[PDB]
Ligand binder design. Structure first.
Ligand code: PNM
Length: 255
């Protein structure tokens, strides 16, 4: 068999049409970055950096969205049962050093909460889910934490497709599971919009080398799904990805 199979698995192949967003380049100074927007009503993609929008990268903590949905679907989590007790292990982030529910664990990106979830899910069940939802390369061979700078990788465009599929009820997850998960990542809720999203950060060679912020803005007549990805030697993290996203979104007058 050919190595090329593996190279081709590292990229999402689509020839979807898109509006070019090359004027967004200044926002990504210092990074190889990408921004993907999908306008639900107009059924239209807009993209800055198409090549980077199709490169698959470890999802890191953005994977927690689907890990939670999987857990609801397996009845590991339920609508009134999202609490996990802290094992008394001291982490460098104090918010991690306490009992959690779905809301706090997503807000504070509490790794151990989601590791526990993955621990209780059958590896072959997870593989089945990743096949169903078409999660990037679907590669969980890597470690035990296959979603953290490991085997599993996904592109910005796919990140956007998955959020859209989730919201348009194209996934087989219960609507109330989706509502719980959306609430856990709801950043802002006003009369005129709901703003939802999740950061991710990956460390490679002791540096912040992989940053994500993915989510959507739901208005009174439309939904705008987005993914921002940053690749850099250092300073490529979720917070910077979110900052950039919010500048772009404000500029587009969505938030
Ligand atoms: C809050 C985090 C920095 S930790 C968590 C997870 C997921 O990506 N990332 C990591 O475990 C890698 C990491 C650990 C410590 C500092 C930076 C990245 N999520 C990060 C985020 O939301 O940006």
């Amino acid at each position: 068999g050919h190595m090329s199979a593996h190279v081709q698995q590292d990229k999402y192949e689509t020839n979807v049409s898109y509006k070019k967003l090359n004027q967004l380049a200044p926002y990504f100074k210092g990074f190889d970055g990408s921004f993907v927007l999908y306008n639900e009503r107009e059924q239209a993609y807009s993209i800055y950096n198409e090549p980077e929008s199709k490169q698959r990268y470890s999802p890191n903590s953005t994977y927690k969205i689907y890990l939670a949905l999987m857990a609801f679907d397996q009845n590991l989590l339920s609508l009134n049962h999202t609490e996990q007790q802290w094992d008394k292990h001291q982490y460098p982030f104090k918010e991690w050093n306490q009992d959690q529910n779905l809301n706090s664990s997503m807000k504070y990106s509490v790794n151990w909460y989601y590791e526990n979830l993955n621990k209780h899910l059958r590896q072959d069940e997870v593989k089945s889910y990743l096949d169903l939802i078409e999660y990037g390369n679907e590669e969980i061979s890597g470690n035990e934490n296959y979603w953290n700078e490991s085997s599993l990788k996904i592109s910005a465009i796919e990140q956007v497709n998955l959020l859209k599929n989730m919201k348009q009820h194209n996934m087989h997850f219960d609507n109330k599971a989706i509502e719980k998960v959306e609430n856990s990542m709801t950043l802002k809720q006003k009369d005129t919009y709901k703003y939802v999203g999740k950061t991710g950060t990956g460390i490679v060679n002791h540096k912040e080398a992989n940053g994500w912020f993915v989510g959507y803005v739901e208005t009174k007549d439309n939904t705008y799904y987005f993914a921002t990805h940053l690749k850099g030697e250092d300073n490529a993290n979720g917070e910077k990805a979110q900052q950039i996203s919010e500048r772009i979104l404000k500029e587009m007058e969505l938030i």
